Design a protein around this ligand. Structure first.
Ligand SMILES: Nc1ncnc2c1ncn2[C@@H]1O[C@H](COP(=O)(O)OP(=O)(O)O)[C@@H](O)[C@H]1O
Ligand SMILES: Nc1ncnc2c1ncn2[C@@H]1O[C@H](COP(=O)(O)OP(=O)(O)O)[C@@H](O)[C@H]1O
Ligand SMILES: Nc1ncnc2c1ncn2[C@@H]1O[C@H](COP(=O)(O)OP(=O)(O)O)[C@@H](O)[C@H]1O
Ligand SMILES: Nc1ncnc2c1ncn2[C@@H]1O[C@H](COP(=O)(O)OP(=O)(O)O)[C@@H](O)[C@H]1O
Ligand SMILES: Nc1ncnc2c1ncn2[C@@H]1O[C@H](COP(=O)(O)OP(=O)(O)O)[C@@H](O)[C@H]1O
Ligand SMILES: [Mg+2]
Ligand SMILES: [Mg+2]
Ligand SMILES: [Mg+2]
Ligand SMILES: [Mg+2]
Ligand SMILES: [Mg+2]
Lengths: 367, 367, 367, 367, 367
């Protein structure tokens, strides 16, 4: 019977069978719809495109992320991506597997309840479970204690975890993420003259960000040395064939995680939020958290991030103590891996919510 | 029941039954009327001649193109060519077939509405459809994606088409075409002393253009080598028996498509309009358009055209990317072929406008 | 009711009933008046003689052609020849037949109007019509397209005709004809000593011309070979019994048609005027005219004419194309035959000008 | 010493002395160059025409906007318009005045730096300043708080401003403007048969737009009532003397600001961008912005615009709160007025960039 | 040094020194050659006569226009008229003056190159220039903008000129002119019985045309009133002493300019060609052209022409706008005057083609 593990973040769906090393289907959470009413016969007609297929045809389509900052915005679009996921990639009847789904912490109750309702009623599932992302990543690490920073496309979290357990009062979410950074890279990019106005172009700049951008160790020194352009400008080539050259924009895009004032947010940088989260925890356990802080998610993938974190958190925390930061490679799939390994635990098998139990207890029992 | 496919361009009517490889009736859109009041008895009297028959007797007749730059100028003349077409070549009662008609994009609304009105009221037709030329040519290519350059006698278009669909905001029409080029060849030809003042003589120079003229790869180099006349002068023989020798006029006639400043137009050459049309399209799809650009129509028939296009568009577009130009032989009949194949599609059968539906909905439903 | 066809050229009247192969009455247009006041009793008295009767008595009479170069010179004389024609040869009341009359193209308006006035008022005719000669000859040919050269006694024409119709702007008349040639043969003949001063003798030299004169293929070569007189001198016998021997005068008389400089006219030869007439026509139709050029009239009867025409026109026109000259035997009566066949066409019956229509519309309606 | 205030937008330069009610020189930003090489002697020769002078002679000239979407495209052309501006209209040595220049927000850095370089090096200026347009318009309003929508010929902005200050993260620019609307009015106008292909004709249609076009309160209802043409068709007269009659094209041209899908852009209408800009601002201040939203620029001049804005923004925003829209007359000159009043403030006198300060600090100090 | 201005049109040479009010030598371009080989001793012998001298002796000579429809037909004849012009009227060594020559627009390249070759090689000239006629006439007007209609003996032009400059694509030539009109007056004149067959008589009818013929305001009304002959018949006296009376032929001769169908040409009347030329020009400038249309040349000299033009062009053009026609007296010499004034401009002195520059650059540099 095994299980399905579906990691539904903004920007990417990662899904696959439990007990495996990596997700088989990994595609963008997008629902493409034709921008221009098309006059042909035999075409499509394909009123709605989804996932990688939508990526193939961006210049026709308006791309629409169904899920924004972890919150589901458009429910039938989400349903569409699930249906496509199950039948067109994993090729499976949901009635044959229990399904573990994912969600961000501190996330409105409507997502869990609606989600489960869909999984039971529209797809028919024997049993399912919805899990907090950071815990899954911590399992992926193979560790029981630590503070997880999970930055995906929608949202960034800090969840401190001690010896199992958890500290809900110290959990801190922050809407800064690949989507916010891509938009910021948009408007900063436009100062070189390169105008990317459209949803489809947003995905191009996402690609630019993913390849070229890095996190500087020291910001203003790097900005100073951007004066005499040497290695800092890099050439990137668009799908059109045009050449973009980007210098300080390469590293000032991700600087926004440390300085959210660039987007005009008062929220403290990710280092201050991790630090702050540690502060909120009991005096006894802070040393372990500082030692053991973990990173997850696509927005942790910028080269340089861990080193800057180690500088900044060390600058905030008492110097007498060791702050090791653990950011393993393959960290973008940590959540999914966590899901897999959890589904492979027998002790967890009692915790699935059964179809019948949902039917008799109602929606309130997901929590 | 089959269908009729009528391609009504300026200069030539191509018409025939659907599902066939080529149009059966192909004759000039001309309405000849005697210039000189003729004194005989038993003659004609034949107040109006039409089509090839008018071609047979040019020296008596004033030839009159009913259709100018795609726009219908003289409606009863057009009606005459249709009536002659149906009864004297295709030999068919229009009440027995649905009829697919053609038109240029971006063309005044009066042509569709009046045209349909005539087809329903004067001829009686069970159902009909009016189609954009470039789409038909694209079907003739057997392809779904590409940018069509269709240069006929009246008008030249660029219509970009992606994966079916269409981009109306990037559609670009241009009045440069076999008629404009024939007149330009007139006045340039007169510099050798050869005076062709009359409508009938215009058709002679059209013949000269069709046979002899070619498009140079590089213009000014060829003009330079015209200094020492070798292969560039060619002898042509008129119907009278006189011999014309034309050198640089051979290739400087079609150079006007690339340099409309020869006619005193500010419009950019056809290569700049194709390039410009590609620019107007979304950054994602431009690579396909550059790869896939298609040619149609009689004014694409000059030897050398495709090679010059490949030079010039390559000179405008980023060198990193492949610009294949597809100009198949039999391209002059691409539109008609496209019409045939579309009429042979069953999925299109729903889209005919029915006689009764027109009667109840009115003229506004053609669009 | 049938019709009468009256071909009134200078030198001969040809008249007869329509629908017949040849004119019944064919006699010279002459009005003889006694030169010498005659003293007898019972004689004549016959103050005016007309036609063949005048021919019978030339030595008494002064002969007077009423019609000169197609233009009527003396109206009552013309009336006399008509009256004699109708009552003394055709033996018919004009009130019983419509009457088709003939005239040269480009001929003063006074001839049509006066002529019609006479036919309606003096003779009483139910209806009549006046026709351009060359068209009648073209009907006689049984053809619709061609360029007619009609050389009679008064005038020579070229009228190009295409597919019915006509080209008035290319019609070319020329006063060179049997009368001019007979006078030229007079003065050239006098170099042998043979003096023919009188009107009556002019008719004798007309006979000489009609029998003996021929058109040389090459002129100056024939003149050279006239040096050694062999076949070129021929003996002719006058009515008196005297013998005339004429050598180069035989062929240099008709050479005047090709070289009007012999009479001191600047007008180009008949071959240049036919060629010139073709030039004036639209470039399209010239090939048909060159193929189809027709000959009519008494002054086309010289042996050798067609062959010289074929040489000379071929020398002027582009060699690439075939110039067939059609000069049928019985061509002297082509105009009359044409008239007959036209009168036998029913479609022409609407075009007669009725007595009453003339009465109410006036003289201006003949044109 | 006073100051010069130069508002350099696409389509119009507005310039004048500071502290005055209106700009003295207001002329189009165009650089006319003869299309046809002219053969006269004493003519011009005038290789380049500029401004209103170019407007005087459109039919000879190719008109060329030097500045496109706020971005300077052709630098020497811009220099030419400045030189003409200073010496031929304002009649002033730039060395005698500090000069305040204008620019759109979010505009490539090349414009500020190059612009300043030209002003200091080519013209010699004691000091200068470059200002964001929307702030100047807000000063023109005489108000400190509000959200400015400035639609010129090149670009449209939204800049929210609270109690002085500014919110750069909520600034939103959009390339929809009089130029885009004129081109759209071109292709929509061509459906009536009226073909305007040339740059010179573009200026004619700009005139049509400026006089006749209005913004409908409700779109599709007005389109429905366009069925029975009454007041909606209006006659306009071209400079040639021809009469154009335009019905629904009158109001569907400016509908593009609310529905950029007409041009094939995915960008939300101006009402959604203003609404969106308000959303991006802190929850506290939105009420003031909704109350206080200001309009500027030539493309705000369509009759009906404010009323439709009030409908649409009210439809998006919570009904409980008052949305006053302030669109004062003389709003096309708001930016220039703003510039004047700012230059008349003494407190601003410290902020000029001095010639010497530029010389020692370099180009980087403009920002 | 001054200059010579030689206006070489068909029918008349106008030549003189530059900077003068009128040409000194004005005589017909004819090369008379004796028709009849003359037997005297001491006579002539004068194998070739030229100009006014030939006019003195028409009845002996065959007159030969060397130049036909602007195109040089017979080069040595033209050379003869030039040589006679320089030595026998202007009495000048060409080596002492630069020489400005004239030619029709749109005229075969052979005329410029051969002409210049003769002027440099046969006559020896320090420098020369060949000019388009209509521009010269426009200078004669003292104006910079306008559309010139120049009708000479060979050819009629329309050249639109705006603010200096020129529009070559709107230049329209037409072979209708005093020569065509004189021949048409020939064949129409022959309907009264007056036969003029010879070149010498053609010049007589040219005189008739020049004195008597006028252009009717309304054609068919005047033809109707020709029914009752009052003032419309006028008596003219030939050099022989005979009296010609011509009625409707007086005004129907020049009606051919408005109705070229009289000669069997499909070309539109001169009013349609002026109107058509205006159409071809950019929409901006048409109002000036309509206001400013100029007339030049001998074939503009018919009384009534300007008024009929004003009627007909007003009937074609939109009524809302003023069509002033400027036809100054002395307009037959406008071209020559233009030439004079141009030669008197110092700015033009750079544009002469020098003997040496021709020698080193070749013939291709005349254009
Ligand atoms: N190599 C990379 N470098 C920088 N950013 C990346 C990289 N890969 C992905 N991203 C960013 O992170 C996001 C994907 O992160 P992911 O963990 O998949 O988010 P989620 O799990 O919420 O879908 C993308 O939207 C992208 O902006
Ligand atoms: N072989 C040829 N070479 C160059 N030009 C041609 C050739 N054949 C036709 N043309 C030109 O193209 C025109 C015919 O093109 P066509 O596609 O039939 O126009 P349409 O479809 O609008 O009637 C003619 O008017 C002629 O000027
Ligand atoms: N056999 C002949 N050979 C040469 N010339 C002839 C011959 N017969 C007649 N002609 C000439 O042609 C004239 C008759 O031609 P015809 O066609 O009858 O003139 P029309 O029709 O104008 O009367 C006569 O005047 C005579 O000079
Ligand atoms: N009365 C009007 N109605 C509608 N549009 C107008 C009017 N006047 C000007 N425009 C449009 O606005 C533009 C001028 O706006 P403006 O604010 O001067 O732009 P900028 O300041 O950027 O030059 C013109 O290009 C024109 O298309
Ligand atoms: N007063 C007149 N009225 C009408 N036509 C005239 C008059 N004078 C001259 N012409 C005609 O115009 C011609 C002369 O025009 P001109 O301008 O001198 O021609 P070009 O300059 O080409 O020699 C003559 O051939 C004559 O037919
Ligand atoms: Mg995630
Ligand atoms: Mg076509
Ligand atoms: Mg005859
Ligand atoms: Mg502005
Ligand atoms: Mg002239």
């Amino acid at each position: 019977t095994t299980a399905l593990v579906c990691d539904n973040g903004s920007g990417l769906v990662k899904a696959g069978f439990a007990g495996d090393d990596a997700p088989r289907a990994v595609f963008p959470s997008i629902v493409g719809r034709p921008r221009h009413q098309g006059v042909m016969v035999g075409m499509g007609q394909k009123d709605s495109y989804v996932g990688d297929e939508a990526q193939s045809k961006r210049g026709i389509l308006t791309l629409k992320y169904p899920i924004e900052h972890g919150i589901i915005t458009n429910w039938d679009d989400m349903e569409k991506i699930w249906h496509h996921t199950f039948y067109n990639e994993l090729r499976v009847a949901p009635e044959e597997h229990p399904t573990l789904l994912t969600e961000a912490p501190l996330n409105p109750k409507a997502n869990r309840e609606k989600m489960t309702q869909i999984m039971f009623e529209t797809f028919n599932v024997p049993a399912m479970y919805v899990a907090i992302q950071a815990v899954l990543s911590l399992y992926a690490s193979g560790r029981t204690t630590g503070i997880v920073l999970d930055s995906g496309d929608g949202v960034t979290h800090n969840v401190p975890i001690y010896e199992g357990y958890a500290l809900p009062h110290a959990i801190m979410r922050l809407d800064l993420a690949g989507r916010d950074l891509t938009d910021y890279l948009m408007k900063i990019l436009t100062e070189r003259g390169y105008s990317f106005v459209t949803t489809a172009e947003r995905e191009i700049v996402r690609d630019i960000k993913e390849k070229l951008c890095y996190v500087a160790l020291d910001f203003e020194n790097e900005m100073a040395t951007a004066a005499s352009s040497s290695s800092l400008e890099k050439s990137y080539e668009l799908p059109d064939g045009q050449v973009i050259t980007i210098g300080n924009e390469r590293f000032r895009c991700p600087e926004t995680l440390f300085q959210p004032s660039f987007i005009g947010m008062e929220s403290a940088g990710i280092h201050e939020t991790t630090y702050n989260s540690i502060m909120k925890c009991d005096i006894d356990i802070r040393k372990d958290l500082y030692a053991n802080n973990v990173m997850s998610g696509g927005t942790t993938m910028y080269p340089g991030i861990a080193d800057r974190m180690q500088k900044e958190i060390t600058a905030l925390a008492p110097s007498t103590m060791k702050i090791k930061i653990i950011a393993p490679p393959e960290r973008k799939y940590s959540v999914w891996i966590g899901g897999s390994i959890l589904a492979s635990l027998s002790t967890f098998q009692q915790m699935w919510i059964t179809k019948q139990e949902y039917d008799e207890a109602g929606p309130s029992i997901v929590h």
